[PDB]
Design a protein around this ligand. Structure first.
Ligand SMILES: *[C@@H]1O[C@H](CO)[C@@H](O[C@@H]2O[C@H](CO)[C@@H](O)[C@H](O)[C@H]2NC(C)=O)[C@H](O)[C@H]1NC(C)=O
Ligand SMILES: *[C@@H]1O[C@H](CO)[C@@H](O)[C@H](O)[C@H]1NC(C)=O
Lengths: 49, 49
């Protein structure tokens, strides 16, 4: 009794920002490079209803 | 400090704080005053002071 439907998609808005390390800083800028979530990406959508 | 990090850093790229691994306290490191030394003289011929 499961009805199957086509997969749906939506957009991300500046998500996936996490403290890349365990070091304190303050009031200052910093450039980092790591495995992130690029902005305005297209994510896959799932319901349970 | 947030409860998950153990240091504090500066632009100078050296530590300036530290969480003491016993008391959970936060200590600031201030370097000693090196300064500079200059000397004033009125000449050898006139005097030695
Ligand atoms: C998000 O990703 C999905 C999956 O790639 C995109 O859906 C495709 O869009 C193209 C362009 O219209 C179609 O030719 C494909 O048939 C679509 N595939 C599926 C499975 O639907 C979608 O366009 C992307 N963007 C948005 C805004 O959803
Ligand atoms: C170590 O033992 C002391 C007492 O001997 C205790 O006060 C302290 O909480 C313990 N842990 C650390 C990290 O110092």
């Amino acid at each position: 009794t499961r009805t199957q439907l086509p997969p749906a998609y939506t957009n991300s808005f500046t998500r996936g920002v996490y403290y890349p390390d365990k070091v304190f800083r303050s009031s200052v800028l910093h450039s980092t490079q790591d495995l992130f979530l690029p902005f305005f990406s297209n994510v896959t959508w799932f319901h349970a209803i | 400090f947030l409860p998950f990090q153990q240091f504090g850093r500066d632009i100078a790229d050296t530590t300036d704080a530290v969480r003491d691994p016993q008391t959970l306290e936060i200590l600031d490191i201030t370097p000693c005053s090196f300064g500079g030394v200059s000397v004033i003289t009125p000449g050898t011929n006139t005097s030695n002071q």
